[PDB]
Design a protein around this ligand. Structure first.
Ligand SMILES: Cc1ncc(COP(=O)(O)O)c(CN)c1O
Ligand SMILES: Cc1ncc(COP(=O)(O)O)c(CN)c1O
Lengths: 335, 335
């Protein structure tokens, strides 16, 4: 379900990033020895364009995505795409394909996929000197259920997604490749998603396969938010950073610290952990109802979406839809 | 430097691996949303075709490569290419491109690159249901120096290539992507290669960026071989397994165990480690002369190729060239 067009930009070592153009969406060509096809030298991003009540098309923290694509590129030995070029590509695609952006203002938006891959031929294991950047778009958010249906999660004990010193803080295809097998063991146990544990001690909660994770401890004015601190092997999600800000705004104490599977299980059983949710671009916030850790399955509270979870989701979606004021300057005009 | 042709085989879920064909080497097409370009779902192999004095074209342990491509595929949630299909692809390419196989019998051979990548379009993070296998060839081994010029190695202390529970025992593009940055820090220190350390304790020797590593302890009839045991995060190299066999054949004691950087440095200084070499398909055996670990640089013996190193290399290359008998049935006719 792609849109009509795509943006293409080439990299060559003498020229840097050049030949930026908008062209029809269609097949691309690679030499059989193109580095991406052998040594996976690639990085990507994910963000949305939203249609507002007034007809404008907006982005949410697109500057953060621009900068994160550069951070990912750096870790993967890929020449950085300048932020201004990243942002301009978004505007260029929206200019031609804006009719594809869904109506205001519910769960529906246009998902934008900026991505870079090594195109240089040659089987030597080294950073490429030729790359391509593409920007493609896909409508998203239909049949969402208000984004509020709780999920069950499988704790991966046999597989490890990334490790300290590795590529887990980069949005890099290889992290996702590594996760595919565990994702199947999750389904076989009837689970919707996988929670990943740290590589060194195999205990500390990292993130889900495509989302960060938050815990709510206590309730009322006493309610606290805790999320795994940036370990160097989990993704610094933009939704995650936004929700830390909104929690501060709302007067909740927040903690970025290490939290292990034992604490989670123990504190959920004792009722100290009152809610758990996952967060990310696509779903915004997804409540977590139940957890399978080895043989044992445990429920979070009554398995229903939590009050803090749903309050934070209301606020963030409202800002993104232009129905709440944008205190932090997250929203920008794309078209 | 590719040859004239390539073998192509497609995978589709209803059909399995099908439409095997030999076609000219040339650009291939992918949908912009092809899974390989986003989530790096790919695995590969590397082996050689050798021309013998009698005009025959042979492979060395190609059955092991066939089986390893399946092991890698399994870990990456890719449908296995049957061994018979793998082997037949080699014969099919050699049938048309045998003129490309260099002369007998020195360092020169034809490098074969079998590889699989996910082609299914769609941005969902899941295993593809459509793949392509390609087999391409490149002449190799010219200007080798007899393969005996010693290298210097940089011990990666800041970067980690793979970890337990991960993809390090699979020949998977993402492992190589992860290693690119450290490879640059190596050059900046004037080093030829990188030695990788274990993810959990950051001490145990794993392998080089494209080769396994052996240590020779003692000399004469007393000489011992030690190599890192299969940790689950280093590649079970076929050259490595072959050299364990040849050492047994030659009457050397061999150890597959854990060995850390401290032991290496200490025992090399004390003269207990008399030789170090790296091994792999391309170079066979490469002597290691010097090691940079942080600020410190240390030499292995007199920095010259060791006697065990060169004896093992003589034997293995001889078998591969048909000048020594093939006790273990490693050699097979390709053409
Ligand atoms: C592994 C991983 N973790 C977390 C996230 C959440 O990131 P963000 O909030 O920026 O969408 C994503 C989605 N990019 C992800 O793929
Ligand atoms: C990371 C790594 N380790 C070791 C090896 C050696 O493997 P082999 O002997 O099978 O060539 C290779 C080359 N495949 C490699 O890429």
């Amino acid at each position: 379900y792609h849109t009509d067009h795509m943006v293409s930009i080439d990299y060559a070592e003498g020229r840097g990033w050049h030949n930026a153009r908008v062209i029809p969406y269609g097949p691309i060509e690679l030499d059989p020895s193109a580095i991406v096809l052998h040594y996976a030298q690639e990085v990507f991003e994910g963000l949305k364009a939203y249609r507002w009540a007034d007809g404008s098309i907006v982005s949410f923290r697109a500057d953060a995505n621009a900068a994160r694509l550069r951070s990912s590129a750096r870790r993967l030995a890929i020449p950085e795409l300048p932020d201004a070029v990243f942002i301009e590509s978004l505007r260029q695609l929206i200019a031609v394909d804006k009719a594809w952006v869904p109506g205001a203002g519910g769960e529906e938006a246009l998902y934008l996929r900026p991505f870079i891959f090594a195109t240089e031929p040659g089987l030597g294991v080294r950073p490429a000197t030729q790359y391509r950047y593409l920007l493609i778009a896909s409508p998203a958010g239909a049949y969402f259920k208000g984004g509020i249906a709780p999920v069950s999660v499988w704790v991966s004990t046999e597989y490890v997604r990334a490790c300290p010193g590795g590529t887990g803080a980069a949005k890099f295809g290889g992290n996702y490749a590594a996760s595919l097998l565990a994702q199947a063991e999750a389904a076989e146990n009837g689970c919707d998603q996988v929670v990943w544990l740290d590589a060194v001690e195999r205990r500390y909660i990292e993130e889900m396969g495509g989302m960060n994770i938050f815990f709510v401890l206590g309730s009322g004015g006493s309610a606290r938010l805790v999320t795994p601190e940036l370990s160097g092997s989990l993704l610094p999600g933009i939704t995650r950073d936004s929700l830390l800000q909104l929690a501060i705004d709302a007067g909740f104490a927040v903690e970025e610290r290490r939290i292990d599977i034992d604490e989670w299980q123990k504190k959920a059983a004792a009722g100290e952990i009152t809610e758990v949710f996952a967060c990310g671009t696509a779903a915004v916030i997804t409540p977590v109802a139940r957890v399978r850790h080895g043989a044992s399955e445990f429920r979070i509270a009554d398995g229903q979406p939590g009050e803090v979870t749903m309050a934070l989701r209301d606020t963030l979606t409202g800002i993104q839809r232009g129905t709440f004021a944008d205190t932090h300057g997250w929203m920008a005009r794309l078209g």
